[PDB]
């Protein structure tokens with residue numbers, strides 16, 4: 480039997496950088512919402528203990544792939560606590576719609592979907608807390624996807640308070656440039672002093688992304704996409720870019736703007752989701 484599992488994108492609806500820890504990571508205040516749009520991961524169980532990703536992700540080696548790393552990490556954690564039925568393995572395939580890189584979190588979502596699916600399929604019985612703890616070792620974005628709810632995130636992104644932001648419609652655009660996440664976070668001029676504020680304050684304040692000014696300055700393609708969208712709707716960088724999104728109250732308006740968009744915006748339209756499609760599938 481094959482099972483299929485959603486791997487949704489996320490948006491950072493706002494993002495404030497509040498400081499930096501000694502190990503390099505930044506402490507932030509951000510608001511995660513899923514999109515009802517993303518990759519689909521298909522899994523067929525194996526009985527020989529092997530883990531095989533059958534569909535390569537462009538530019539990613541098999542053992543570097545967050546899909547394989549998640550699966551191996553669950554297998555090692557489960558086997559070390561006696562929670563791995565003998566012979567547990569998997570064949571994994573992905574229909575990948577999310578850009579590799581871009582701020583939509585596709586790789587982290589892939590890892591989270593694999594952790595959740597294989598925990599169920601192999602019957603490891605790991606708790607949400609346990610999966611999120613292992614997920615954090617694969618990326619600071621992974622716990623929000625594991626836990627499955629829109630959330631106000633503090634710390635480095637793993638301190639998650641569920642909130643239900645309005646589920647807007649979004650035109651998500653991908654500028655034609657790859658921005659490595661470390662470039663933004665290493666920039667001397669990145670805000671790392673935005674005051675830490677309460678969720679009420681942040682919900683009433685206009686949403687912004689502290690990384691946007693640097694992404695726009697350093698990558699002309701991002702500035703171009705943001706300038707175009709800003710004529711139609713509130714629009715912002717998500718993550719550290721390059722992806723930008725525009726927010727609409729209705730599906731109709733979002734799709735009309737996308738119809739007008741030059742092809743170099745590389746756009747799609749999707750609705751916000753406060754419950755992850757992964758967790759809606761798990762019901």
Ligand SMILES: Nc1ncnc2c1ncn2[C@@H]1O[C@H](COP(=O)(O)OP(=O)(O)O)[C@@H](O)[C@H]1O
Pocket residue numbers: 536538539543544545546578579580581582583584585586587588589660718720
């Ligand atoms: N299954 C995967 N999907 C996407 N990227 C992956 C995957 N496995 C490893 N990666 C790596 O992670 C990076 C992209 O991660 P992703 O979460 O897509 O970033 P972003 O948040 O910028 O979209 C790439 O450098 C790539 O090498």
Ligand SMILES: Nc1nc(=O)[nH]cc1C#CCNS(=O)(=O)C1CCCC1
Pocket residue numbers: 491494503504505506507509619620632634635636637660664717718719
């Ligand atoms: N806290 C971090 N510090 C770093 O130095 N690197 C990565 C970090 C992370 C994280 C949680 N994911 S996130 O989406 O909220 C974040 C990633 C893109 C922009 C916002």
